[PDB]
Design a protein around this ligand. Structure first.
Ligand SMILES: C[S@@+](CC[C@H](N)C(=O)[O-])C[C@H]1O[C@@H](n2cnc3c(N)ncnc32)[C@H](O)[C@@H]1O
Ligand SMILES: C[S@@+](CC[C@H](N)C(=O)[O-])C[C@H]1O[C@@H](n2cnc3c(N)ncnc32)[C@H](O)[C@@H]1O
Ligand code: NA
Lengths: 483, 19, 483, 19
């Protein structure tokens, strides 16, 4: 393989991935075209530029010794390769809920700030993408230190995974299960973003003099970049800067071996002591895996950015795009009520799987969306208008019984329509999962498309129930709640 | 509660052409 | 690390592992001593000598092309990474039970014969260990072809696993779960044999002139040897030679991607067409994993030699050692009856978990073991003695009700005694599996020790049932069956 | 049945010092 052929291929890849979106109906074809080009490049390269002679668990002792010398907690847990979640931490003694059992001083972290002071510093000061996007900066920080045998962070880097289950690693037929879903567009964007960035930085490293000292000047493969961005997207956090005035992105060694379970955030940054601190989410008996709660993300975010699907995610949600139509004769009034309420005229809202399917913001939007002219004037004029605006997001204080019946009818119809745009039904998806033997990645894709439809089906039932509740209040001429 | 809550794998924008 | 340092360590290792057996109470200490030496060597070496740039699945298309070019079946299935079993074959069309769906011609196989005709030929012709042990010769055949870039079998070797779950890969504390079991002695032997062999052959390769042209002279690590013997242990088969006169050991590409399920052997060698042939064990719909039945092995054999534990193994068994003592005054008569029955006076028998807990041979032994002098004479003298020997293994024709009561009493007591020699109880093992989060390898060890005890407990219960049944037949003076 | 049944992973003796 010649370096001129790879440079030609990355130039073609850069041009392909910088073109504008060819319209949603050609996105699958574009995705496959980009995949074909990436795989041609990947097959002509040697995988990860830097690989380590030992097994991943061979390096966990060095991680512990390094973390201990720099003031981190290293007693009371051990690293175990769990089947369901991969490597994680297991308690070696009983740990009580709310016990401060894990702490990591700032010196151990990799941050945008440590990226700036490293060998990447010169190129960082020149490139507009690196300056604007701390996540990409972290990824290149990871790669440069990985390729630096004397790096301070070598004990952390040598214990990182070598592969991930983000969609960047899926086969084409595994992504194909997601055709017609909401999620697949984010899969497309992730793949095109990553390919464009790889080609862009491949050329930048060649052309910039400030990149002459980087080990990436000698070797920078697609596999390198896919590994680095996947390492960052599955593990990065936001912390305050040392001054406490701004926030920065970081990687937190040792702590980021914890796997996810449902609960509440119990990890916080301690600025007085300058360290990350983790208290136990629940009691952990000796021999039990130590879990944390990653955050209130949807399963689409867990799959695309974290590389796993979480069963019983109580924060799961899908998107729903809604806006007041400029052809509506009440557009001006509706837009103004929405503006006074702090809500855009058009937006992407969320439908949740939990007991309230819609947020206060979505409820307020739908109320205005279905308001009559008389109702709109009562939200625009007079000494009670701001009071009425103030309660627009509150389920307890409807505008009118008729307004509620109209809005839940609309939501029922729209969620029903959204269900009819999927290639498969919920029952078909359950049959696929029961009757076929599938890879982990394939199961993630199918569970994701199943989960989108299950949220919409629950919204249909929820809206139908609410429509009947408010139709009852209307027929019984119940007094409206006030104040 | 926590002054600086820490979210593992916090979702960031990777679209270098958008914002 | 210098070459002289490794040579001194393998010299120490060869001596340590060539020492005689230290006695059963010393075997755990010897095991940890040998692990200490091996791990010190392994930490001074660079893992696998040859690694490939792509991932494992990147090479499956080359395996298929190479297999197709040489006459193997390559249509109707695809390779999938299954969570439970690792990579396996999945049907891409409906395959009917007994359909010949897979076949592999001899030219694709790796065999002792192909080992003799390779670059290993010279060393093979003068080394007494290679000539005597085809399994070890296959392991070096694998390693030599692995380090030969133009090898005919490169598409097969590049698709093999890089790591296994045989006990050679367990942590010390994962093997520690097996203390006090029957299985752990074979774990000890496997570890000592492998260490001795690596140390022996490392010195051979560095000095013997017939090894000057082997790629292994440039690099031969402990990881290399552990990988090679584990590849052979988990996958090797016995086939006839091309002339049908004798048997040989072999590796069968493509077919050995099938994973195991309960059933019957459906793979045979077709000597007329000179190819391996596999017919479908059951119906496989498109999208279902294709399984074969590996053979009627115990879970101890599956763990130690195949690297997995098989739930609901219908052929699972434990050993029970029994012999007529020379202190018995009836020894001579008992020994003669057993001899005429073709049963040794002392042997290792099996207890099984499924419907018939003892074999015909063990039942026959236990009957003779418990016979009175008069019963023995009826099996040695007169015109019905041979007929009585013939039926000795048949549960339908007891010697006498009293003989049955005594033998089932004995078996009940002996299996209860064996149960008490374990460090844990069945209930304690179930609690560990329920209340601890364990690695796959740790779970294999605990399920193996639990399984030994469950077979003994079922033997205790079956013997108690049988003792009561025959005691009822006796106390009611029931007539004994005849013929 | 099968004239030459093939057993996957057939158990062999690895004790070189035995014989
Ligand atoms: C912050 S890391 C946790 C440590 C990781 N398991 C490792 O071996 O390095 C996040 C990764 O762990 C895995 N993970 C975390 N929680 C999980 C869960 N509940 N189920 C499956 N995988 C999980 C996913 O692979 C995810 O990308
Ligand atoms: C002959 S190979 C089969 C192909 C293998 N899975 C691979 O990826 O190369 C035997 C190995 O497959 C795995 N295996 C086969 N059957 C299994 C089963 N029923 N459950 C778990 N693992 C199994 C074990 O790792 C075993 O050593
Ligand atoms: Na022991």
């Amino acid at each position: 393989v010649s370096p001129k052929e790879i440079l030609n291929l990355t130039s073609e890849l850069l041009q392909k991935c910088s073109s504008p979106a060819p319209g949603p109906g050609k996105e699958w074809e574009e995705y496959v075209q980009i995949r074909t080009l990436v795989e041609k490049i990947r097959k002509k390269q040697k995988g990860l530029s830097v690989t380590f002679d030992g097994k991943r668990e061979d390096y966990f002792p060095d991680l512990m010794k390094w973390a201990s010398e720099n003031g981190a907690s290293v007693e009371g847990f051990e690293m175990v390769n769990f089947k369901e979640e991969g490597f994680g931490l297991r308690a070696t003694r009983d740990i009580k809920a709310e016990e401060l059992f894990l702490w990591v001083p700032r010196k151990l972290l990799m941050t945008v700030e440590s990226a700036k002071n490293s060998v990447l510093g010169p190129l960082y000061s020149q490139d507009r993408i690196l300056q604007a996007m701390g996540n990409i900066a972290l990824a290149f920080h990871l790669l440069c230190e990985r390729a630096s045998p004397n790096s301070f962070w070598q004990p952390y880097i040598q214990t990182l995974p070598s592969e991930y289950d983000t969609p960047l690693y899926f086969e084409e037929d595994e992504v194909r299960y997601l055709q017609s879903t909401q999620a697949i567009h984010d899969v497309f964007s992730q793949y095109k973003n990553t390919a464009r960035q790889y080609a862009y930085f491949y050329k930048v490293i060649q052309t910039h003099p400030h990149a002459n000292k980087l080990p990436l000047k000698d070797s920078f493969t697609y596999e390198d970049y896919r590994w680095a961005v996947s390492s960052v997207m599955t593990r990065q956090v936001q912390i305050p800067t040392e001054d406490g005035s701004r926030v920065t992105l970081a990687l937190i060694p040792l702590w980021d071996m914890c796997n996810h379970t449902n609960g509440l955030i119990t990890t916080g940054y301690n600025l007085e002591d300058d360290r990350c601190e983790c208290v136990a989410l629940q009691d952990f008996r000796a021999g039990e895996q130590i879990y944390i709660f990653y955050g209130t993300r949807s399963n689409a975010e867990f799959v695309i950015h974290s590389g796993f699907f979480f069963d019983n995610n109580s924060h799961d949600r899908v998107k729903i795009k809604l806006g007041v139509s400029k052809s509506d004769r009440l557009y001006a009034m509706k837009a103004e009520v929405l503006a006074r309420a702090g809500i855009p005229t058009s937006s992407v809202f969320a439908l949740h799987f939990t007991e309230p399917p819609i947020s206060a913001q979505l409820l307020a939007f739908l109320r205005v969306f279905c308001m009559t002219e008389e109702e709109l004037k009562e939200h625009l004029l007079g000494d009670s208008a701001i009071d009425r605006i103030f309660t627009l997001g509150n389920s307890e204080f409807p505008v009118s019984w008729d307004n509620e019946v109209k809005l839940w009818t609309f939501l029922e119809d729209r969620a029903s329509l959204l269900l009819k745009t999927y290639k498969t039904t919920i029952e078909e998806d359950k049959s696929v999962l029961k009757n076929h033997d599938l890879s982990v990645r394939a199961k993630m894709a199918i569970k994701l498309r199943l989960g989108e439809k299950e949220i919409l089906e629950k919204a249909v039932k929820s809206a139908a129930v609410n429509r009947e509740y408010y139709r009852q209040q209307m027929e019984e001429k119940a007094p409206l709640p006030k104040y | 509660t926590l002054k600086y809550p820490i979210e593992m794998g916090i979702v960031t924008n990777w679209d270098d052409m958008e914002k």
